Write a protein that binds this ligand. Structure first.
Ligand SMILES: Nc1ncnc2c1ncn2[C@@H]1O[C@H](COP(=O)(O)OP(=O)(O)O)[C@@H](O)[C@H]1O
Ligand SMILES: [Mg+2]
Ligand SMILES: [Mg+2]
Ligand SMILES: [Mg+2]
Lengths: 454, 454, 427, 426, 123, 123
């Protein structure tokens, strides 16, 4: 009735079994009751006090853990390492020779028995593969009609009209790379095309990635995971977009290059780029075939000014009754007039708006203005400061609403705030302003005035 | 009788029990007096010299203890990390399978048997970095009304008018960052505004953190516990304020952005920074949604120096009757004239007050007075030193009161000991001086004379 | 009967041998059935209840594994280092004493037995060199009539007619240099010739090397891997073709020169290199055996433009319903006539088509036109932008069929995206 | 008759107890003569080949030591932590359940049977905290008047005039740090200021400490004990001085910072630091609030060196008969003349006075003299060696006194005993 | 007559002795020749298959080396530390309980029986 | 024929040899043919079921290599440091007790038997 246990290590044609038990690898004459085939390399076996097996059973469920490094060329042996970087070679259990082995996983081993019994799974859930539901639509974007229609043609049409591309044998673009001065709104349309796709379903899926998010193991882990998740979410027949913001994190590139060249195995996914620096990106990405379509986003002009302001300056916000009486209580007409006035003033070439003095290679001097270095984020800050001044005035004085003078003060103030604040210069802006004359620059200063690093 | 002791692993239909005993596994037969199902999995049991179970008792209460990492799929196995990162998989205990299992706990185990027995409770002391009564008030800072109003706009206004922002659809900024040369008042403005808003409850918190102690239970876990405490205290509905003094500890920056974006949903939490250096801060922090307003604290000018002197030389200190007779019983005007005299000598552009000579790369030179290298801490260090000189004058003469000559000597002294101290300097000083002159600096000379590195 | 196992130490002439078992070393006799000399030093053996060796077996295949630090001068012992900085002197197995012993190997060791068993080597398996199949032959190559047959003579002919070259005793040009403006089919002709050789074994090793791939130790080990792989690939005698891309980044030079000189002596190796910037090409790479044929690829003329446009404008694409009546259902005639019209539009020397004005030292403002600055990539941009405009048109009107006016508008839209010369200014 | 040994585990009502023996746990019935109540959980017991408890015994006095981490709610188990952080849960011996068990204590435990056996007192002589009455006055210190006045202002003026500082709202400093070249009277200035403040009481303490003593039981315990003793000795209101000579050895630092920040509330405490390397000190210590006042003591100049030589040579100097005639035998002026001539000689820019050479990184070579490498300790050494060599000479000749060349010989031997690219001594 | 070895731990006046051998400490009878005073505390002793101490010799001279931490108040047991930071309380040899014992010394120890032998000199 | 192995530590005038075997230390009688004076110390020797020394074998050639720290003045004791900073005193070898050894050399020792065997040359 009492009985010990052992683990099989080898078998012979003579129906004799090698068993590890009592810390010793003995050879045993198996009982004729059981067969010679159901015995498994790594199978626990009962033993009698006469030291003879009477049963072949299950596999060990508890023991030392290790990480698999290599499967030996023979195929029956695995080279693994332990807790304190102790490394050993073991054999494999029959279940190991319910998923197949992937070198780099974890195994359950008994070092004294020298046998691995089970691939033990360790899983960590990553939030990067989690999709994102975009929030802002094209009604929140202004002064980008040409570029928004370009992105419409280059992104939403292939998903909506795959069959038209098929019958015309036109390969849809695979990589779109936006570029523009910082604060123009690249991210806005980049994450609003996903809303456009979601609304254009007569199930869109977006997955955002940030450079600082993937600038920290190392970063190359998540690229394969996100690409595979996109491949899975695309093979089901649904549109999907992977978005890479701030390509400046890239120049590692070659793995991404290989993956994007393999992306041609898929036909309903586009990687969308975005950057403030065209130069700093690795040009191999920009080579046609991987990232083909380029779209420039421009600093808003005078026309785009009132258009983008109207987006922030809705009729919802309170306005002082004097302004309403100025146009007989017509909110639309009065707000249109005031936004026209403020965009004219901010785009006017008054002495306050004087920003930059250029020192060309031939010494040509021009007094530039903030109206030439404007951006969307500047408009956001301006309207925010206008609202803050208006609410302070309402609190202190009592009358509610908004007035033009608030914006007039905010616009003249905010230039000083952003003067010391960074992103006030860009090499592309210098190149664009110098293209008219064709002369380099070595001296830059503002016009309150501060120097610039050139 | 001489009886052994083992631990049960699992039962069997044949009324046979697997038991770990003598350091190895065996299979035995229980007594007919006991029921096999009555045995509990992973329970101690006694034996007889005939190797037969007679009865079983409670679970072993001592032995090894490991750290719970995860619970396996079927629930009868757990994966636990050892003392020296010695990971092993073990079975569970029947009482362990109300007070359920939670990953991250500890388990009483025996390595050889591989059977957990208990989950001991452990306690951790709270970090005690909590609210402090804000001692400094607005009336204790001089010559910063611009920054006073800026911080009040950014922090004080929102909670007083929570619904007013929703009236104008203004998203309140959360990250308010301070900076400026050392010894200017940044550490005090945060406490002052906390005191103001607390007094504005006619029921508010504050969480000071300094740079050193977060270089010293793990730093990431420390920040995590600070942030969860802040969020759960803000959940009460009252406004709360967080304050990372000396963000030069932050550049493991990554996690911090994650918690800031998490608390972005919260409506009553603020992140407030402080630093003498803007460069060493991680630029990823300086983006909208994260730290928004880059309020700059500047070395006080002549008027602000007069104010901050007036914040110390109050009319409630012993004033010498000699100068008092010059003003006929009015201590206020006497100490006022004291203040103008001392500030005039302090900011005087005389040869004594020459501090630095700035030699630029072009070769030009610029003599610098202490007025441009002043600070807010030096005013403390000179007023208190003058008071100490008054004490020693009283000791050596017996005449009480304070005289102008004390501060007159104190100014030249404070310049004397700090002649070897570049603590008044900051990279922004060189940058702004080069911008003002238009030439990059190459050499530094003070007027003893020293050449601090360029 | 039940029995254990032991590990041999060293034999003795008295029908006995030292053997380690049960955690200690004994001296045991062996059965007369076996010969002690036949037993290998370190061969695992079986025992008995009487504690006597019965027969041999196989060497233990599992245990600890250690980095062989060095081999002792005795020729049968060696010092190895364990995982925990432990250093042990151990014996050596008979198979270990023909892949010789070198420092840094990984050896199988049992600490109790103190015996090395087997040198498990690391498997440095990499795919920095791979075989890739061609995509399209010259059948889709447009406007390169005279640029393909000489390539066929250069590389395709020598393998098929080796006897003629043996009679001539003439070495085929192992390298042909390709250069010109970007987007002129430099890779396309290489792919075409690779496909043609892949259709002429009625068995083709093609290797592609990229400049970024070279930029991936330093470049020496990489390029050595590619060149040696080419060596064993050409060893079999199967025709081998190698390609190199945009060598402007290259020319280190001497190591590449030595490698290509070494591979020059090989018989059936052919390598073709192409690069855009001919001017910055080092003449040293042009030495005999290397690339000696320099073929200039230039911007297409009217007929080459016709051919290349017809290559992408196959009759399998829809044609405007209204314009079908003009050609009476002849879709091919409509397509070719419209291609003629569009090619004339690009090649029209009108104010619209002006590209660049350059003032030389002689005061001439030579007006450049897109007909002088056309390329295959530019043509592809033309055709696919026109096709996208046609898709938008049919979407907004519901009438299928590619219309010429869409191509005409594409022509104007597409051109806003891309004596010694002294002044340059685009028009 | 031979008998083994085991460890008791628990007790049972049926004349049976569990025993750990030979590495395994068993259940055994004790001999009837012994009583179960007598046996204590964890008491070593005597076994036999019959496997029966025959009589009780002592408790184990060997094994491993593990630091207690927590005491469980069961009142019989304490989660202990091993040598290399191998925590275990063990029973507690009855003598451990008078003195009480506390977190952080050291216990004697056996990993084999998991039973704690006793606590271990980890103590020391604790004589480092023994305050020393100062024995050096300001008169023994010379050439440091600039430092004398300011250290006087820093230290005793707040103590003697706490109220006077009070009506001026001036918060007195807490930390005073001293720094300079080695052997510059730092310990002397500390002892002297202690003596001065001791005289100005009409029960102070000078807890003089040395650095390398702290590296030796654990440093944290010493730095805590000294400061609790300072707190209890300052609770009376008498002035207390806490002095850490050679502070450079430290940089634990965070414990010291937290402790001084906590204890600054007490108004009659002053900390004094001395070191040879300002840079090697952790910056947080020098932050205002902790170390308010900083003082530099530099190498003496010619006047200060003359003062020091006057300190070591009073009017009681035995002089040679040769020197008696020239100065009319007036020692009060003869010693002054000798000091003047020696300070003129040693400070002279002789090639024999070269000590170090400096090669600036901009191609400039400059040589340093003896004067920039003169310290009070070096003056002490040269004066003492001149005196002993004068004694040797007058014993080997017969005519007693002191001669000028003796110290000139003493000068050379003791002295013999932009960026910079290369340095050399000469 | 084969014979093993053991190490003394404590003595008893009942003609019996406490000796650690074969990885276990046990009480054994004593041969008539030896005496409690004759046997030396913490000394190697010859054993027998009959499990009885017969001959006590000189102290064994090789083993581990542990740097002494401190000497506990009782004076019979001292705290020493090991190479891997382990610390153990061990009994002292009679020569260690003349050249005095001070903290900071290296002692020859046999941690199996927790007995220190002598203060090894260092160069 | 089935015979064991042991290592010879010390000799006795009583014509009995100290030997370590089976994870312990015992002293045993030798075969009458061999003589203790002829029996040089240190050589591993063959045993029997009767636990009697039968023949004097050769030296050890496989063990643990460790850098010597110091040779003690008495000459038969050597302090040596192992892999994990462990420091222990061991005996010496017949060749070691004529080639010249230096501190810091690599000596082949076996920890339990505490006997050094030979200095392995370095590269
Ligand atoms: N004869 C041709 N027929 C079709 N397409 C061509 C032809 N010549 C050039 N092209 C186009 O120009 C591009 C040439 O690419 P490649 O051969 O790699 O040279 P490059 O690197 O200079 O662009 C291809 O994308 C192809 O579409
Ligand atoms: Mg953006
Ligand atoms: Mg501050
Ligand atoms: Mg090409």
């Amino acid at each position: 009735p009492p009985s010990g246990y052992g683990v099989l290590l080898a078998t012979h044609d003579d129906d004799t079994v090698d068993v590890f038990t009592s810390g010793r690898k003995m050879r045993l004459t198996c009982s004729p009751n059981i067969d010679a085939a159901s015995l498994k390399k790594g199978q626990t076996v009962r033993l009698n006090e006469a030291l003879t097996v009477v049963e072949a059973g299950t596999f060990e469920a508890v023991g030392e853990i290790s990480t698999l490094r290599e499967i030996l060329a023979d195929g029956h042996r695995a080279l693994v390492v332990g807790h304190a970087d102790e490394e050993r070679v073991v054999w494999l259990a029959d279940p190991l020779i319910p998923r197949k082995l992937r070198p780099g996983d974890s195994l359950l081993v008994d070092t004294k028995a020298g046998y691995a019994f089970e691939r033990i799974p360790k899983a960590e859930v990553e939030d990067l593969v989690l999709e994102e539901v975009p929030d802002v639509s094209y009604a929140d974007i202004g002064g980008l009609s040409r570029q928004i229609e370009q992105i419409r043609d280059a992104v939403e049409l292939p998903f909506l009209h795959k069959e038209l591309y098929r019958e015309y044998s036109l390969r849809p673009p695979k990589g779109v790379l936006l570029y523009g001065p910082p604060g123009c709104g690249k991210t806005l349309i980049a994450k609003a095309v996903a809303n456009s796709l979601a609304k254009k379903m007569a199930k869109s899926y977006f997955l955002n990635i940030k450079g600082p998010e993937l600038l920290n193991g190392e970063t190359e882990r998540h690229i394969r995971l996100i690409f595979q998740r996109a491949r899975e979410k695309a093979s089901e027949g649904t549109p999907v977009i992977v978005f890479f913001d701030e390509m400046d994190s890239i120049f590692v590139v070659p793995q991404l290059l290989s993956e994007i060249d393999g992306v041609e195995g898929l036909e309903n996914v586009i990687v969308i780029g975005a950057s403030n620096r065209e130069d700093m990106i690795d040009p191999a990405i920009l080579r046609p075939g991987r990232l083909d379509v380029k779209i420039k986003i421009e600093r808003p002009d005078a026309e785009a000014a009132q258009d983008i302001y109207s987006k922030y300056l809705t009729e919802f916000l309170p306005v002082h009754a004097d302004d309403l009486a100025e146009f007989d209580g017509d909110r639309s007409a009065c707000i249109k007039a005031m936004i026209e006035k403020v965009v004219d003033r901010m785009y006017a070439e008054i002495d306050d708006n004087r920003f930059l003095e250029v020192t060309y290679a031939n010494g040509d001097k021009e007094v530039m203005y903030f109206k030439d270095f404007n951006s969307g984020a500047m408009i956001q800050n301006v309207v925010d400061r206008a609202k803050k001044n208006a609410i302070k005035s309402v609190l202190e004085t009592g009358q509610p609403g908004l007035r033009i003078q608030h914006l007039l003060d905010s616009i003249v103030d905010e230039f000083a705030e952003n003067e010391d604040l960074p992103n006030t210069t860009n090499p592309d802006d210098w190149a664009r302003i110098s293209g008219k004359k064709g002369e380099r620059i070595v001296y830059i200063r503002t016009l309150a005035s501060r120097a610039i690093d050139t």
